[PDB]
Amino acid sequence: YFQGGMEFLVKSVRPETLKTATLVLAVGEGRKLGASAKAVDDATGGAISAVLKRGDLAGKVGQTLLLQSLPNLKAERVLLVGAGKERELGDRQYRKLASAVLSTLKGLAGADAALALGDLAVKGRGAHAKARLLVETLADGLYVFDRYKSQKAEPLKLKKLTLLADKADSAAVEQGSKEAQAIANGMALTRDLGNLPPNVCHPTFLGEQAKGLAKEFKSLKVEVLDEKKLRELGMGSFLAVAQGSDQPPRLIILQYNGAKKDQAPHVLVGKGITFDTGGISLKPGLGMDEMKFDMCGAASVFGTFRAVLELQLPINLVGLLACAENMPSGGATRPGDIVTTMSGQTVEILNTDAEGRLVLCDALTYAERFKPQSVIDIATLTGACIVALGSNTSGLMGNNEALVRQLLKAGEFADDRAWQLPLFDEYQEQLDSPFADIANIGGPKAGTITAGCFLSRFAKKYHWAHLDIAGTAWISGGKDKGATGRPVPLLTQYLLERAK
Amino acid sequence: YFQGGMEFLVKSVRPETLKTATLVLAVGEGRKLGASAKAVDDATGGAISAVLKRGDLAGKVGQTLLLQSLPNLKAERVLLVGAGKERELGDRQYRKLASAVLSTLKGLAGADAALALGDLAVKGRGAHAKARLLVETLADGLYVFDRYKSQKAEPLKLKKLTLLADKADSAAVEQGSKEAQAIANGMALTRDLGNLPPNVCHPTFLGEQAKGLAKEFKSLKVEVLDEKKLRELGMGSFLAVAQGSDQPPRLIILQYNGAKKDQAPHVLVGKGITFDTGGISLKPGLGMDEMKFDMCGAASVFGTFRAVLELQLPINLVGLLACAENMPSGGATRPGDIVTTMSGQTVEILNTDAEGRLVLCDALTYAERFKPQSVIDIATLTGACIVALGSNTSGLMGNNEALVRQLLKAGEFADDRAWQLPLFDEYQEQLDSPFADIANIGGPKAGTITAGCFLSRFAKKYHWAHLDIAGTAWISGGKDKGATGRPVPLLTQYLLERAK
Ligand SMILES: [Cl-]
Ligand SMILES: [Cl-]
Ligand SMILES: [Cl-]
Ligand SMILES: [Cl-]
Ligand SMILES: [Cl-]
Ligand SMILES: [Cl-]
Ligand SMILES: [Cl-]
Ligand SMILES: [Cl-]
Ligand SMILES: [Cl-]
Ligand SMILES: [Cl-]
Ligand code: NA
Ligand code: NA
Ligand code: NA
Ligand code: NA
Ligand code: NA
Ligand code: NA
Ligand code: NA
Ligand code: NA
Ligand code: NA
Ligand code: NA
């Protein structure tokens, strides 16, 4: 169940007799009230119709009108929210409607609210799929990160949200709500870890977080490998990234065995660069505070595990979090260094700011021992991905078409979308080095793709895919600056489908 | 009277019996309802008190709660707006309160609203001064620029705003409202001219706008000088700016004689660079669309005249709008050119992007013929002013301390503030040229000041001041991108005081 201060219930009772602090109804733009709103209007003797006739609420998506006590209702307030003029909403409009409702309710002193929104239609979504989107939007919309504020906002009075559904849909709605709550809990852990400042959130801290998660979930086993063990394993490019920082690196291994021992596991590999200065290839100063989000890949592995552990899915899951801090220093890796990866391939490190792939490639080699049926790495890897796909769609590459399709489908269902980019063999020659087996960077052309090509050289032994979340893992500026928790919804949906 | 679709009335009637679509009341945070709100609450039998006790409205500045029909009231709706917990508001909080009220009313279908806000106290402001700020904020908040949108917003239903005031204050409130309406009308003309795209708003267009203003106001006389006349006058630096563009330059002269012929006039000189590419000293591409705001100086002279003409102030006023377009071309002015200004001083044009001062200096020489008692130039002159003072405070320089103080005081009253920067003689040597009498730019140090020093060399014959509005004339980005209309409120207030 959701942990962020909200209980979500599903009930099949009549809205017009439900006791609640706020009853929420949808109002169309220039079309008749839906069945639920009409039943409530009838119960009040036409009071809602009479208000709407006065014209303050045009009915555009997300517009609101709040009424107090109406005759013959047990609702203390009635919140009208506009649903536009279309027969069906798209996902974006449904989310906008839900967020407008939540924003209003947050500011009220009501301890609960009941959503009578079952008459809304959303393109391509039945009861379960609508509940997944609605509850995830509501629950994630409650997220707060204020532990470093001396002045904290007043706690919400709102503590309970009831979804009204016809009895024939209530089981699907309940299922969707339960899954959405687990996803939102995972997103909240991901966002917390992403938002923590890098002087607190370093690799050792992430190791202790993993141990704490195992304390909470007896089904989770955790092992944390330090720099001595990494050197024993021959993890040369991983160590090269870490060596310039005072902070020691960590390889965190999470294991959950929800299925029979004969089922091959799915492996999630997360880039956990807790801060990325670029190293000797130093980044510019402007906006470099957002490099604390360079561990959002690893954070999303935490969050996906958190959701899976709550749902107790019948799957075998492994998490590999490759965490290091990338700092300049008198002992840092230099451009031109050549290192031997755990696979034995030598890499010429042309640019020390292309370091995510250097911790990932050793983790991908490590993943071979699990004989996985799928391996997915998640990383804030290339600014080129933002040029290619922006901030709303993650880049996706892989060496197996069926797995890539499974991830695309999961992202569509989750409304946490990705988009495939090709790993054509012609791109690989961009990584040729006169000195070593591989150069760690290509040119300025196709940067997201050549990063995927680099990783692919370590993933040939299994079905593998790669999510570039450089654009989707956080919001850069404004009031809403901070980690997003993506791609936890995509990944959790992928695993939900693999668990059937 | 305000021309943008709003009637402003002042009335001294009881709020609790006033017929209106929406009655607006202030609610303090954690302090008793004020006298007006308490009288309305009493009339409803405690209905407003009873709602507030439920806690939906914390009372923070600008928070709102909208009620429908309440017992025994003639108001169709009651809008409660939070006024915070302080005894007195500052100007910023008063504006925020007013804007929140207006934003709510805009979205309602009510044709009018009545503001019962007389109990609000604002630091240092009596009835007249509060009405000046309130009505100007409301009227300017109604501004719309949509002539290039194919899809225009629905017209507002709100067409009338009534300010309720005690009979002892109603004359002061009425005076403040009348002046604020004239200022807002002037701001709207300024903002229109600033927001027009530069392929429409060129110097010839501004000349026709001046002629149109004289058609509307019989007290205004207008003369428009073309490039032939400028060359006859010897206006060499003005012509040098204009010569690279296909668009001919214009010197627009506005004259209003509201006082006896023995009163020396006040002169406003406006920089009207209708687009500034930098010329041969070409600007970078990023954000260069905002260079259509490089005529906001001249636009503010239009707007100040528009307000003065409506108020029929007993003063003699002259406007000089120096308008040109600054373009690269095969005949454009080159860095290193030396030109002879109308004053006879030679200027070495080191950078063709410091062109505002080159049209202004010839206009300042031209102003000598009016034997003025004050000359104020207004210009979007230096990006250095934004570094120095940001986007909320205009830079102010001058050669006469009394005039500078008068302008500072006017800006404080108007809440359209400026701040003096010094024209110490030591800064002048930055404009030394080995070849000419003056260089048109100093170094990278004290750029706002050295621009003022350059202009001061043309203003020695009269009391003069210079407003750098590079930061305050427009908003750069976001939903509210566009011209602001500043410093029309400061300038109009200055002239209101000079008219007493
Ligand atoms: Cl169903
Ligand atoms: Cl640890
Ligand atoms: Cl250690
Ligand atoms: Cl985007
Ligand atoms: Cl799916
Ligand atoms: Cl008074
Ligand atoms: Cl003209
Ligand atoms: Cl001409
Ligand atoms: Cl600022
Ligand atoms: Cl004043
Ligand atoms: Na719609
Ligand atoms: Na949509
Ligand atoms: Na990097
Ligand atoms: Na990185
Ligand atoms: Na390239
Ligand atoms: Na206050
Ligand atoms: Na204030
Ligand atoms: Na310029
Ligand atoms: Na300019
Ligand atoms: Na300098």
Q: What is the DSSP string of A220-259?
A: EEEEEE-HHHHHHHT-HHHHHHHTTSSSPPEEEEEEEE-S
How many whole angstroms separate alpha carbon A134 and alpha carbon A121? 12
Q: Which residues pair with B338 in a beta bridge?
A: B348
Torsion angles phi and psi, residue A394, rounded to 5: -80, 150
For chain A positions 13-52, those within 8 Å of chain B (CB to CB) are 51
Q: For tokens 């750069």, name the residue.
A: B476
* DSSP element (H, E) containing B181: helix B170-195
Which residues make beta-bridge pairs with A474? Answer: A483
Q: Which residues contact B132 (CB under 8 A, 6 or more apart)?
A: B176, B179, B180, B413, B414
Experimental method: X-ray
Alpha-carbon gap, residue A473 to A379, rounded angstroms: 9
Q: Which two tokens stand for residue B78?
A: 């009651």
> Beta strand pairing status for B75-82 and B64-67?
antiparallel
* Chain B hits for A63, Cβ within 8 Å: 107
Q: Are A333 and A440 in contact (CB under 8 A)?
A: no
Report whether A30 contacts A53 (CB < 8 A).
no
Centre of ligand 8 to C-alpha B226, Å, is 5
Give the Å distances, CA to CA, from B77 to A63, B111, B156, B302, B403.
18, 12, 17, 40, 49
Which of A55, A76, A108 is facing B109, going by the closest CB pair? A55
Strands A112-116 and A160-164: parallel
Q: Which of B433, B434, B440, B279 is nearest to B350 (CA)?
A: B440
Q: What is the dihedral of CA A162, A164, A167, A171, to 10 degrees?
A: -50
Residue A476 has a CB neighbour count (10 Å cut-off) of 13
d(CA A419, CA A407): 9
- In the set A130, A357, A486, A498, the catalytic residue is A357
3-state secondary structure of B385: helix
At B357, list the tokens: 């001062």
CA distances from A499 to A176, A376, A400 (A): 15, 16, 19
In units of Å, what resolution does this entry have?
A: 1.8
Interface size between A and B, measured as CB pairs under 8 A = 26
Select from A108, A103, A95 the least CA-distant residue to A61: A95
Identify the residue among B53, B54, B65, B103 best suited for mutation to test binding to A, counting A beta carbons within 10 A and taking the highest.
B54
Token couple for A234: 């021959």
Can you name the residues that pair with A395 across neighbouring β-strands? A419, A468
Number of H helices, E strands in chain B: 14, 19
User: Residue A487: is the preceding peptide bond cis (ω within 30°)?
Assistant: yes
β-partners of residue A161 are: A8, A113
As a whole number of angstroms, the distance between CA A121 and CA B492 comes to: 56
Is A158's Cβ below 8 Å from some Cβ in B?
no
Task: Provide the shortest C-alpha distance from residue A278 to chain B (in Å).
Answer: 26
Q: Which residue's entry shows tokens 């607006």?
A: B24
A191 given a catalytic annotation? no
Distance from C-alpha of B17 to C-alpha of B445, rounded to nearest angstrom = 63
- Give one DSSP letter per residue of B291-310, joined into a string: GGGGGHHHHHHHHHHHHHHH
In the numeric block, the tokens 């979007």 are attached to B380
* Chain mean position to CA B208: 21
Q: Is the distance from CB of B61 to CB of B5 less than 8 angstroms?
A: no
Q: Write the residue in A55, A108, A154 that is nearest to B56 by C-beta.
A: A108
- Residues from chain A that touch B66, judged by Cβ atoms under 8 A, are 66
Task: Please give the single-letter amino acid code of residue A51.
Answer: V
Ligand whose nearest atom lies closest to the CA of A226? 3
Q: Which of A63, A67, A109 sits opposite B54 (nearest CB)?
A: A109
State whether residue B490 is helix, strand or coil: helix
Place of tokens 């207008």: B222
* Mutation target vs B (from A68, A76, A85, A104; most B CBs, 10 A cutoff): A68
In total, chain B counts a number of residues equal to 500
And the tokens for A90?
């798209």
Q: Which residues of A are annotated as a binding site?
A: 271, 276, 294, 353, 355
Residue B113 Cα to chain centre, angstroms: 27
CB atoms within 10 A of CB A124: 11
Pick from A54, A68, A110: which is nearest to B109 by CB?
A54
Pairing of strands A346-349, A438-439: parallel
Q: Which two tokens stand for residue B163?
A: 């300010």
SS3 A390: coil
DSSP summary character for residue B454: H
Phi, psi of B80, rounded to the nearest 5 degrees: -95, 130
Residues within 8 A of A (CB atoms), B 125-154 only? 154
Q: How many helices (H) and strands (E) does chain A have?
A: 14, 19
Contact residues, chain B, for A51 at CB < 8 Å? 68
Are the C-beta atoms of residues B39 and B62 closer than 8 Å to each other? Answer: no
Spatial neighbors of A212 by CB under 8 A, at least 6 apart, are none
Answer for the pair B235, B458: CB distance below 8 angstroms, yes or no. no
Annotated binding site of A for Mn(2+): 271, 276, 294, 353, 355
Nearest Cα to Cα of residue B7 among B163, B175, B186: B163
- For an interface test with B, which of A54, A80, A158 has the most B Cβ atoms less than 10 Å from its Cβ? A54
In 3-state terms, what secondary structure has residue B393?
Answer: coil
**Nearest residue on chain A to B60, judged by CA atoms?**
A107
List the single residue in A with minimal CA-CA distance to B48: A68
Question: Which residues are bridge partners to B466 per DSSP?
Answer: B377, B397
Counting every residue, how long is chain A? 500
Which ligand does the CA of A498 lie closest to? 5
**C-alpha B272 to ligand 18 mean position (Å):** 11
What Rg value do the Cα atoms of chain A yield, rounded? 25
Tokens of A139: 């629950």
Q: How far is CA A354 from CA A440, A452, B423, in A?
A: 7, 12, 51
Q: What is the CA radius of gyration of chain B?
A: 25
Q: Do B83 and B97 meet the contact criterion of CB atoms below 8 Å apart? A: yes
Q: Measured in whole angstroms, how far is the alpha carbon of residue A223 from the centre of its chain?
A: 24
Report the gap between the CA of A22 and the closest CA in chain B (Å): 12
Cα–Cα distance for residue pair A189/A302, rounded to 1 Å: 7
Through-space distance between the first and last CA atoms of chain B, rounded to whole angstroms? 21
For residues A232, A238, A239 and A241, what is the CA-based torsion angle, rounded to 10 degrees? 180
Distance A28 CA to ligand 3 centre (A): 60
CA of B354 to the centre of ligand 19 (A): 7
CA distance A226 to A207: 10
CB-neighbour burial class of residue A391 (10 A; exposed 0-12, middle 13-18, buried 19+): middle
What spacing in Å lies between the alpha carbon of A345 and ligand 15's midpoint?
22
Distance CA A489, CA A303 (A): 9
Q: How far apart (Å, rounded) are the C-alpha atoms in residues B182 and B313? A: 11
**Residues B113/B138, Cβ–Cβ less than 8 Å:** no
Provide the token pair at A296. Answer: 């959002």
Q: Which residues of A323-347 are buried (b: 16+ CB within 10 A; e: fewer)?
A: bbbbbbeeebbeeebebbbbbebbb
Q: How far is A331 from chain B (nearest CA, A)?
A: 39
d(CA A471, CA B395): 40
Question: DSSP code of B124?
Answer: T
How far apart are the CA of A248 and the centre of ligand 3, in A? 5
Catalytic residue chosen out of the listed positions B283, B409, B457, B461 = B283
Q: What is the bridge-based pairing of β-strands B220-225 and B160-164? A: unpaired
Query: How many A from CA of A292 to the centre of ligand 10?
Result: 50
Contact B107 A68 (CB under 8 A): no
Alpha-carbon distances of A492 from A99, A487, B110, rounded to whole Å: 22, 9, 49
Q: Do A66 and B66 touch (CB under 8 A)?
A: yes
Dig out the tokens for B494 from the structure: 């200055």
Q: Are A438 and A345 a contacting pair, CB within 8 Å?
A: yes
Which of these, A105, A115, A125, lies nearest to A165 by C-alpha position? Answer: A115
A462 and A376 Cβ atoms separated by less than 8 Å: no
Q: Which of B130, B357, B417, B486 is catalytic?
A: B357
Nearest Cα to A3, choosing from A193, A142, A176, A102?
A142
Cβ contact, residue pair A108, B68, below 8 Å: no
In the residue annotation, B283 being an active-site residue is answered as yes
